[PDB]
Symmetry: C2
Subunit: 311 residues, 2 copies
Amino acid sequence: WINVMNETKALMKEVMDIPEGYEILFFGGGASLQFLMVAMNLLNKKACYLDTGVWASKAIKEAENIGEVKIIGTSKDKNYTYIPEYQIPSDYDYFHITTNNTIYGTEIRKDIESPIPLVADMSSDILSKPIDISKYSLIYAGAQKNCGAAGVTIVIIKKEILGKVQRKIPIILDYQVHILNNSMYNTPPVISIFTVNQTLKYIKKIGGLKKIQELNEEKARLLYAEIDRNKIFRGTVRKKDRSIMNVCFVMEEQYKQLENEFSEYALQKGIIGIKGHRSVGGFRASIYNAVTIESVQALIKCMHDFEQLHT
Amino acid sequence: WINVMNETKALMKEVMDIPEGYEILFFGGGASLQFLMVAMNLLNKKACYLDTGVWASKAIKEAENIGEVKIIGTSKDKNYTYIPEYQIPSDYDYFHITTNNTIYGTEIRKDIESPIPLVADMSSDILSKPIDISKYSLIYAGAQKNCGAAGVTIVIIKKEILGKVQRKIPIILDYQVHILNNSMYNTPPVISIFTVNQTLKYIKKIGGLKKIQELNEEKARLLYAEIDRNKIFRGTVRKKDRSIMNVCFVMEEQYKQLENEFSEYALQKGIIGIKGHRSVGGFRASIYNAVTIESVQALIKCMHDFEQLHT
């Protein structure tokens, strides 16, 4: 509905500092529909992508169906534990990144510079920190972060980038049409958003994106310090690439045998939901926006006590 | 927070007609944590389950780790296109069903009778129709329906069923403890729910669960009628088991060759998001609570026009 959407737009502008020249769109269809719409709308001759995990590789695959794609770095060689070095080529139509790779615990934390239009999938991390929206040509966030509603996918788009593709774009997939019709052309459930309004209202209430990041940074910093001091565990991700939202860790070499015992020790101390993805093993602490500082400290104490128990 | 949770509880009681003797709990962890908690808390000697799809089979697998499980029917033989016949044995600790099997387009639409405590995973369908909550011992709904927030999992539990398991239940997994502590022991993000409050407020606003079901029934009935009259398509699910929320259909035998052409024809008429799961193929119309009547009619017209074009 026009009023919930329109209020959500003004909350987004305010909370995220979105300046003129950007349109906000709400879609059904999850991130996967954006994987398609991004390429349909922006890939005229060729695009480039950075492959930093599962969702990056899915966005890549979808774009490959539309046209020429150059993957200018992949960290797949070491199971996605770092963000590759890359040089953005100046002759491509756009550069697509995925800024947080949830199950691998890596993140691109800064707003990078780019010689060509920058597209970012911020599905996991969109309202976790301030963004300099001016550096981006298109930011999107959906489908499935994490395990919730049919849901809405947000698109923030610098309208001037559109119009360059020669291919005929079906109307339902053309960003211009959705912009022209105020994001009312093929709406998602009003309930599917109605939440975002609330969520933005909460972020504003608690003190804003800067506050939220400063809190996540503090939590991540306390946990990685423990993982770094603690002889039983090892962080899997290269330091400079460490996510502050998803903190991946595994047993040190000598102690791979204690992996099940720690899961149980932590269970008995009331700590669950830390099992790493199948493809990483070990563990993964999800530091949601306001998971508290205190429960990270409880995981830290549990890790420390476990260490002392086995030395 | 106590006030959002507590308001949500009173909205749930009212919207769902939840009588005394039932506790409402909110958890982090998705449906998968309930797969574990259900068995941990209720499986003393043995339980029985009905295998009607992916999530049913996951709940089964998890319970199998805890103790003896009898699968009293499975429709896996025909790729889950029907709900099996079964007889609930009277000597098991509980019977677990999954009432809507999203990707297969099947549903158990009635509240069934049972000689033993009835547990139902209603993750996709919990607020889609009135329920006679008295027939159930435990209803839960999470993790991931469909593609949204970190989210909350709802548990509605007939408190008198608890206490029968001899196994020592870790505190964090013990429903009694969560009940005792008003669902405040290990809370999910307040934002993770805050939505449900809104969603319930909307259901109430629009006229309630009965209204919503009557609308879904009407939509499903118009679409299955077209699928039934229309020579190009076939419903994959046995009539009596047809879901009113997820409507699966495939090309008729003579026309399997036109499957891609129809997807494109529908695209050009503005119709997307109907691709069937990988494991069914064909198509699947998601009739969300208020997807409109009108867009189902638009799919119907598109199907009909396509039929005329190829005869």
